[PDB]
Amino acid sequence: SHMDASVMSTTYALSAAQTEIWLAQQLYPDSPVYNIAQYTVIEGVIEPAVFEAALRQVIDEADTLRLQFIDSDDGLRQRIGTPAWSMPVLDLTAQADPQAAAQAWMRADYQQPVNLTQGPLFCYALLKVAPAQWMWYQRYHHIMMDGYGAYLIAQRVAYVYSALCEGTTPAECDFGSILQLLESDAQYQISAQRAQDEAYWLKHCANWSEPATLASRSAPVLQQRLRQTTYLAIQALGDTAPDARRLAQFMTAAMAAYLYRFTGEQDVVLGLPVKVRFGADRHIPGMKSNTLPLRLTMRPGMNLSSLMQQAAQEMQSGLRHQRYPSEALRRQLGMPSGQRLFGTTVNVMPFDLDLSFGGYSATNHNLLNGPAEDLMLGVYWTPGSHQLRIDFDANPACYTPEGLGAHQRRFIRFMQVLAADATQPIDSIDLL
Ligand SMILES: CCCCCCCC(=O)SCCNC(=O)CCNC(=O)[C@H](O)C(C)(C)COP(=O)(O)OP(=O)(O)OC[C@H]1O[C@@H](n2cnc3c(N)ncnc32)[C@H](O)[C@@H]1OP(=O)(O)O
């Protein structure tokens, strides 16, 4: 079959991270849990023709957006292809409730599983929800985009659209090619760097135990996350974290403390999503992120400062080795097939939420952030702002909306009490 020879000749292997997504997606091919999505609210007038010109330009510039996947006897393969696509424009301003109609439209798209060999793998759409209020909806499959990549694209699209609105030529894009991302990952897989990283992680999680969880059960995730959202003032942590790093340290320390106070587990392993973007990888939209195991030991009557100490140590030791995939680590330690290294992940996203489109201000709002195996604490923070957005994303098989809400309210309060006195022992604090 010359047809099969040609597909193998004209394609590239998936990266390790892409492969892990592909395998998980194959387990539940009808589950939409690997869709990621957000919308950008623009407080102004958008011209859809110019917006679509900007999207065409960024689809040329971010070639991950033109990735095509083709199955082979040696697994899924990819190439820079020729996806057909369109930008729907919906004026919902005459609806009884335009905001709800916009949410319903976006949800109708992101609830649908993407077929990886047919696409479309992304969706871009414009939804007018009030006079001078527009929403730009962005949806991706996780195999070809992660959070930082989506952030890079939204920034570029805002920039290009603003230049085209002004009638000037957009300055040259600084994105690299997804091909160089793939080649660098291919070299990592056979690298001595990876052998070192693996050694560190095997030594680090030498032996384990069932992860502390807030649910009555552990189950695979098949449905879209249950989400509870709270907006919090960053005054409520003091100056504990004027820093993305220290914010991640505080969020992990607090979540570990909550898990201990609620479950009695003293060895709490959390998942810490990381970007895995050094050097040139910082400018290549596509799928790159990893999730590290982060171990926090709850000593007798220890305080918040101690826990944050411990978390900072874990981060400063393990972040250098962040390229080693956590599922590779799982397999290599020889764990039971279905059992995780962590159930609760702490996803801190210090990405600027603000944009400007044609002199009009805009803000980003997450809709989907990946699968919620158990519980994921998503934290959105524009560096410098005094405001955080905190999501509890949970597996619907393991949590109820109101149980999750009660946990979030208890945790938010607990968290504010901890940051109100980092020296207080965590056993000594009442919780709702
Ligand atoms: C469409 C909707 C979009 C949203 C969908 C999201 C879907 C997803 O699930 S994808 C995941 C999204 N989440 C993320 O990307 C997580 C981002 N957050 C984080 O990475 C962590 O929380 C955070 C904030 C602690 C990372 O902290 P950060 O300071 O950036 O560390 P990082 O840049 O990774 O590297 C630092 C360490 O790497 C090590 N390192 C190794 N090599 C190098 C190198 N060449 N250069 C620099 N550091 C290196 C060093 O030890 C370094 O430590 P230090 O700077 O102290 O010397």
Automatic annotation (TrEMBL):
Q: Which family does it belong to?
A: Belongs to the ATP-dependent AMP-binding enzyme family.
The organism sits in which domain of life? Bacteria
Recorded protein name is: Non-ribosomal peptide synthetase modules
Q: Which residues form the signal peptide?
A: none
Which source organism does the UniProt entry give?
Mycetohabitans rhizoxinica (strain DSM 19002 / CIP 109453 / HKI 454)
